Design a protein around this nucleic acid. Structure first.
Ligand code: ADP
Ligand code: ADP
Ligand code: MG
Ligand code: MG
Ligand code: MN
Ligand code: MN
Lengths: 374, 381, 368, 374
DNA sequence: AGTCGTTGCTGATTGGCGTTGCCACCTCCAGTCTGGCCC
DNA sequence: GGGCCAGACTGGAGGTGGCAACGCCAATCAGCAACGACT
């Protein structure tokens, strides 16, 4: 997956209709591009449009629908977001739009109008919310729950994977590796044990024994037990990526039922430590490396060719930030296009390609450069 | 010639975990008997044959049994795809039904055809048009809005209707044949399809509406509606199937045929006393099958475990309860009249009185509730 | 009088990511063409018509199209339900199928039918017997059912000079199985003895995907699938049997080769060996991409070796479907092995291990 | 509650014993002091040591006890943290220490030894863990869950109060304002109703009706209902504080059962919207204002005069960071003393006094200025 | 022959896990209005 | 000047989900009482 063009209209502080087309002259090199501007200018809104057009959700707002829509700018009657992406050499277009009744800002919100269509063929593939979501999840390999963890790293949620519950971590691992048969086995074992127990109200004790081993509703126990091998396979790639980002640390799987990743401190005579004890910047780098590995775990099936992350660089000093940027530049050689949100002057000076989200004082609105207007 | 106009069978629909197999089978048998009695030439099913893209096994069994038992009558049959059933699911049986005096259309572009009478002579020009999915008739392009795309879709569907009717007229030529038309879309006589955009066909048998009605006062454009009640909002209404007759190449008349009710249903309102009073009417009746009820208890802050009460009331009755609900929605929060009041100043009794004042209860229970509340403060001291 | 014997079509089977629609279509049209050429009197399909109990949309379209095209030929046809086929999926359309010179049997106990010739005269007795569910009727129960059913057909035939044919979807002693062959009667029967078949003039059987003469007698045969349904049988040509009868006795049996349209190959050895074996398709320009199973003999990570495998394949007109190592990944190990690794950490008492293993296996089978 | 002295010994990257006194020649003006240094140097470790000394717990580590102690430095057999704080004009001392068996860099973690004492006369007031926690909670007025919301803002958890669920916001408010009786009322009502029900009467019906109004287990419902006045007072104070911190926004409570706050964008003609739409920097400023309002709310019952901000200053741009620092300077001109940790280069010049922390050539340890060495 | 350091043996808390209800999104409609024209 | 007709909607219910507050049970933690462990 890679993003070809982004078109948005009246989202947050970005009043008006804006079209950002990559593969143009400034973005032809697939190099580093950074979105710069004051706080509250709408930088995150650019990344919110990409997530909105694809998965009908944005990281800040759980859902946007008829009942509620806090994403469209005030004193405006409509909003829309549309993205062009390319999977396996074929381009597709996703579209999400909503209009207020009678074109008046006080009117009630109407149902969204969604589409998914090939760019060159022009044929429409889906026109409903559920159909579009399922088809785009199948096509890209990753739905929203995997996009937000392996392709877009939102503000303040870089450590979501490490800090997530073991249940959520195992569920994400199954989603990426397509191994739900273990969860189904555990769930039906629990269901059959419950049925036998109610029929009681020598098979019952054996069913209870099997339930205590692998049985659980929605398959928690056996999912967690089975996903250890996937966790080790992910940890290998995580170490490979982290060696370039931050040479001090290495990752090693916890020896406990709740699947977790310990860390090895090579400077401290290879003394192993829990992952909770890492610093803020070290945890950010560990999470970034782990997410890159997570996107490299399914490279053979559905490769991901872009990465977006949001102001995670604020926790790094001038040297660790430089090492991380050298690693990101080296990874940019593979052809993965990286987009960064930041305010650090050093990296803003380093990166030459910028999308300046200029702010208009007093009004509360904002605008891009004139070349992106439409 | 004579044809029937029906649609919205919704075969295989599950209605609150219930199955409509017996009702659908009875309706299909009655329709076969009616066709035999009235000597009909064709039957038109305007979409929503199946309630889903992958109907269960018994829905397919019912469809197969109908299409095989129709062979005795010798009358033709036309089945069209709706917004519910799947184009591929209906196209599965296209060629196999082509040998069984049946034609099914699911995709666009299917050319007009001539319906033969019972003796084989050309009777009418069918001009079949199924539910036109947007993915079939338009090509998406970048740089449009939510309303502009809908405008393009409406223009395209109107153009499709006009061109297909022109082709049907070309096929008809000079022979006096009534050009019937078909569709499965919403009309209002905006996203709906205006009725004035329809071609001047001799008859238009539409679908997508479960209630029989005439559109724009034009008797030659009608919605046949569902033959069975598919929800509690239409339980008491009678259902009709149109019997259409043509003469000398022009429409003659439309007759409504009542579909007998197989599974009775009813809906009740009011408090528990009113529910008991309305349930009294079923005290001693032999009901085959038991009647299905929707109960809407009007809220007076009874706040009881009403499921058990309904189960006890309807236990001895020949009654099965599918759904019961209530309108209990209300917000619960304090309004600060002035900033000078803080939670330390106000007493517990004062806060409780503020809580109760937001409820519209009366002194018949306010005194007892206040006494009960004071008992709690008594037992902590 | 001639009869084409085929079975185990497995319509709608998803081979990994790929689908078998094109192969099945190019088989069905060829089968119709050969039926017309040999002016066969009937075509019999003994079991596993559909890969599963809820076939996809295109599989049913292929089946209906084949039945429709049968009418232009004029041959009678018979369908039987296999171990993977389900009642209320073949039996739901039975009534419509009758009008098209086709009889479909899924439930046991069906009375024997007289199979007409192309001229309308009787040709044989069919004895339609599908895959017999144990609940519908054990080794003796299969035998006496076959004997009783044959006896009923014998009474029906009387003294007329016609052959008697029998059907079945079951495993037999001396057969060779494959990975794609799903087992049946896991807890009650192991194999049916070939000597217990009633003395019918010919037997048509399915279930096994490999053509085999069983028991040593000619009048009992496995016809096998018409297309390769697993990677362990790619190189073996597939057969359809054109049996012939005359004067109430078997005349001869002939094998017809189904022309292969989808090349499939299996690779072996180390990465160095595979880098040379892949050169079989360098600049050959096979218009149907070849499906490959790569049995790499390395200990390197699968998710790392697949990258270089794809890199090598990108310059070739080939498409890899499966890669297996001959550390471990979850996509490799079997469910039984993974569950046993849980049992090992628990106490290793066999007295409970056997019961737990049986319970886990039956749970997994109920999922499947 | 003002931190006078801080003593720690072998915590995280700070090997050896150190003491920082906030009454020496530096910090005499009670002004801004900026703990500065590279990533993973022990900056966060200082605040973690303060929190550990006060409440036997750390923002990162859920509990430090006879087991799972991972705050102690590697290859070290003992660690301790001691602080001196002043409440109501008199100073106290808190002490927490743990040592390994046989004073080896391995072995069993011995049960920690804690104490609380007055500096006026040296009398030991509590030595048990539970008694020390209860006594320090009664003395200060702040439990851990209120200290970490008002005085110490960890990195990434500044918006914890804003994003907390209604239950754990109402529970915080009732304990902060000393209005806990409403929770006990709901608990008693629910217990009475359950006891009446289990016997199975019109009295049961009345109990059920009363329970539907205010009754709930753990006292959630009536507490949430009653704390509306407290939330309104708090949002009033927060708005008054925020007028000078960020002039664009105001704050008000919404008409919902959940205790929630909405912003009123004064620039866009007072258009009111939920806080979920706030930018990162705007949400940081709103959370800082809410924390200051939390401090001001109980100023008439127990006064807290210290504030520590771990991170989140990066989310702000230069043109906003200067205004935020000016507002912080205005607040610091009062009795409150505040300390800020950041890596941004702008704050290097504005704050003249710094508790510099430096690592040592990759040895894995770190040391701060020798003037703080014991 | 005196002092201490370490280790089991008991109450409390408490946090995941399952349970029973209880709220958010689609797809077909009857109720609600509001302005213009002619007698 | 009033009654009738024609536009223009519209929120709303039967299915699907997710989550919220409980009740429960296994796990954990803080005091005690020995018990050993040194000079
Ligand atoms: N519905 C809305 N109407 C108008 N402005 C909005 C709306 N929702 C959010 N905003 C504002 O839009 C801006 C978006 O900025 P954002 O992209 O979050 O900035 P940053 O990149 O610094 O995090 C903020 O000022 C936010 O408050
Ligand atoms: N038990 C431990 N022993 C030694 N070092 C540790 C231990 N736990 C954490 N550390 C290290 O101590 C350092 C603490 O840095 P921290 O104060 O979090 O940095 P920052 O202020 O940049 O967030 C990190 O390098 C961390 O990995
Ligand atoms: Mg930190
Ligand atoms: Mg942001
Ligand atoms: Mn088989
Ligand atoms: Mn088979």
């Amino acid at each position: 997956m890679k993003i070809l063009s982004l078109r948005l209209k009246n989202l947050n502080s970005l009043k008006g209709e804006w079209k950002i087309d990559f593969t143009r002259e400034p973005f032809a090199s697939n190099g580093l591009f950074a979105i710069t501007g004051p706080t509250g200018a709408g930088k995150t809104t650019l990344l919110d449009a990409i997530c909105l057009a694809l998965y009908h959700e944005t990281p800040r707002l759980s859902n946007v629908s008829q009942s509620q829509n806090d994403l469209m700018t005030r004193d405006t009657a409509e909003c829309l977001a549309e993205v062009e992406f390319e999977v396996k050499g074929e381009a597709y277009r996703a579209f999400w739009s909503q209009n207020r009744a009678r074109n008046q800002p006080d009117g009630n919100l109407q149902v969204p109008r969604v589409e998914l269509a090939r760019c060159a063929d022009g044929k429409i593939l889906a026109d409903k919310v559920k159909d579009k979501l399922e088809l785009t999840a199948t096509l890209t390999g990753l739905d929203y729950g995997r996009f937000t963890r392996s392709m877009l790293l939102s503000q303040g949620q870089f450590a979501a994977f490490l800090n997530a519950k073991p249940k959520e971590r195992a569920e994400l691992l199954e989603e990426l590796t397509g191994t739900e048969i273990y969860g189904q086995i555990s769930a039906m074992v629990f269901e059959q044990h419950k049925s036998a127990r109610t029929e009681l109200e020598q098979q019952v004790e054996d069913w209870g024994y099997l339930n205590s081993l692998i049985g659980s509703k929605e398959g928690d126990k056996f999912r967690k037990f089975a996903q250890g091998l996937t966790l080790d396979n992910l940890v290998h790639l995580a170490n490979q990526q982290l060696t370039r980002l931050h040479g001090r640390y290495l990752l090693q799987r916890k020896a406990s039922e709740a699947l977790e990743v310990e860390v090895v401190d090579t400077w401290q005579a290879d003394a192993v430590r829990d992952t909770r004890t890492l610093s803020g910047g070290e945890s950010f780098l560990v999470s970034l490396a782990l997410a890159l590995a997570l996107s490299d775990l399914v490279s053979h099936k559905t490769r991901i060719d872009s990465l977006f992350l949001d102001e995670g660089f604020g926790t790094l000093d001038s040297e660790t930030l430089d090492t991380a940027l050298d690693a990101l530049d080296a990874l940019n050689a593979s052809g993965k296009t990286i987009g960064v949100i930041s305010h650090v002057e050093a990296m803003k000076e380093r990166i030459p390609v910028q999308i300046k989200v200029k702010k208009i004082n007093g009004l509360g609105y904002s605008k891009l450069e004139s070349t992106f207007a439409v | 010639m004579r044809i029937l106009h029906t649609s919205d069978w919704h075969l295989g629909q599950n209605f609150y975990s219930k199955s409509r197999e017996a009702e659908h089978q009875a309706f299909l048998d009655w329709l076969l008997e009616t066709a035999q009695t009235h000597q009909v030439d064709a039957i038109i099913v305007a979409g929503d044959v199946f309630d889903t893209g992958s109907p269960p096994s018994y829905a397919r069994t019912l469809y197969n049994r109908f299409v095989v038992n129709l062979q005795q009558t010798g009358c033709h049959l036309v089945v069209l795809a709706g917004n519910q059933d799947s184009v591929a699911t209906l196209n599965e049986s296209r060629d196999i039904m082509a040998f069984l005096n049946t034609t099914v259309v699911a995709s666009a572009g299917h050319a007009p055809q001539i319906l033969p009478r019972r003796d084989g002579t050309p009777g009418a020009v069918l001009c079949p048009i199924p539910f036109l999915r947007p993915r079939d008739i338009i090509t998406s392009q970048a740089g449009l809005n939510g309303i502009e795309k809908q405008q393009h879709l409406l223009a395209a569907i109107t153009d499709y209707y006009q061109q297909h009717y022109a082709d049907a007229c070309k096929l008809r030529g000079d022979q006096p044949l009534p050009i019937i038309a078909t569709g499965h879309l919403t009309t209002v006589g905006l996203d709906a399809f205006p009725a004035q955009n329809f071609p001047p066909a001799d008859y238009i048998a539409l679908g997508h509406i479960h209630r029989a009605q005439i559109i724009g006062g034009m008797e030659h454009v009608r919605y046949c509606g569902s033959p069975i009640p598919l929800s509690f909002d239409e339980c008491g209404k009678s259902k009709y199937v149109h019997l259409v007759t043509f003469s000398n190449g022009k429409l003659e008349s439309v007759e409504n045929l009542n579909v007998p009710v197989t599974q009775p249903m009813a809906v009740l309102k009011g408090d528990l006393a009113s529910i008991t009073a309305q349930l009294e009417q079923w005290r001693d009746v032999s009901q085959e099958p038991p009647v299905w009820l929707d109960i809407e208890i009007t809220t007076d802050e009874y706040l009881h475990d009403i499921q058990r009460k309904i189960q006890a009331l309807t236990e001895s009755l020949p009654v099965e309860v599918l759904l019961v609900r209530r309108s209990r929605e209300q917000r619960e929060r304090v309004l600060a009249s002035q900033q000078r009041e803080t939670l330390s100043e106000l007493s517990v009794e004062e806060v409780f009185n503020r809580r109760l004042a937001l409820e519209e209860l009366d002194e018949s229970q306010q005194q007892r509730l206040q006494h009960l509340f004071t008992t709690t403060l008594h037992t902590l001291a």
